[PDB]
């Protein structure tokens, strides 16, 4: 509720406004362990729960019930993430799940289909991912068509900012939780493909943690 006390060096640096934006943190691949980092840079992040499911466990009296929650976050302009958490009571699960969703926000790469006319709208390449017997593939699509996908993964693609794509699924897609994790891995690998336009060598610079001096 009230103003937060930094625990890490990065937290102190953000508090002093010594770092510009998230893209250098992404460039240097630094771990994030505190959810106030994301919302200090990115307001208006929409969150939306998929469903809540009970889980059992046998005990002397009977069966012990816990509740599992599915939560994803996104800004519809290139940032998306999800979190999974179970707890003994539903309400705790939703708030705690939101924290992991904020902690797992990643950037996406958006490309062109054919000719370029500003505001990239589709995937740069075709990418796919697998998580335990579920495979989801994304294909670039021409401008104008809508999203052709299941209702579950259409929301994730809508919140990721991708405008045109083709989708195909294989394996046992009945596991909704696994399906979302497979789509998230496929989107996570968009920046992992080396297109020919990235062949130019880049210059390495020292990280903000190294070249800044933290407060006591």
């Amino acid at each position: 509720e009230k103003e937060w006390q930094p625990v890490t060096k990065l937290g102190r640096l953000v508090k002093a406004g010594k770092i510009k934006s998230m893209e250098e943190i992404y460039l240097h691949s630094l771990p994030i362990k505190e959810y106030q980092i994301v919302d200090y840079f990115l307001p208006k992040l929409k969150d939306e729960v998929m469903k809540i499911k009970p889980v059992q466990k046998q005990t002397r009296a009977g069966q012990r019930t816990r509740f599992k929650a599915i939560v994803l976050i996104g800004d519809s302009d290139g940032h998306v993430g999800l979190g999974i958490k179970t707890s003994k009571e539903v309400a705790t699960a939703i708030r705690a799940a939101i924290i992991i969703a904020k902690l797992s926000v990643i950037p996406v790469r958006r490309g062109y289909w054919g000719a370029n006319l500003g505001r990239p709208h589709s995937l740069p390449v075709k990418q796919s991912g697998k998580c335990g017997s579920v495979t989801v593939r994304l294909i670039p699509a021409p401008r104008g068509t809508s999203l052709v996908a299941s209702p579950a993964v259409k929301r994730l693609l809508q919140l990721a900012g991708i405008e045109d794509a083709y989708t195909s699924s294989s394996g046992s897609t009945k596991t909704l939780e696994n399906t979302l994790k497979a789509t998230f891995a496929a989107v996570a690998n968009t920046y992992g493909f080396l297109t020919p336009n990235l062949w130019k060598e880049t210059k390495l610079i020292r990280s903000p943690l190294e070249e800044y001096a933290d407060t006591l």
Binding site: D47, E48, V49, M50, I52, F67, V90, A91
Partner: peptide, 21 residues
């Protein structure tokens, strides 16, 4: 019970929100 809690909470944005009659 899980369905009951989701409507009861009235603090989160669900995928589909029913409108009474």
């Amino acid at each position: 019970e899980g369905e009951a809690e989701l409507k009861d909470e009235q603090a989160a944005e669900e995928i589909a929100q029913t409108e009474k009659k």
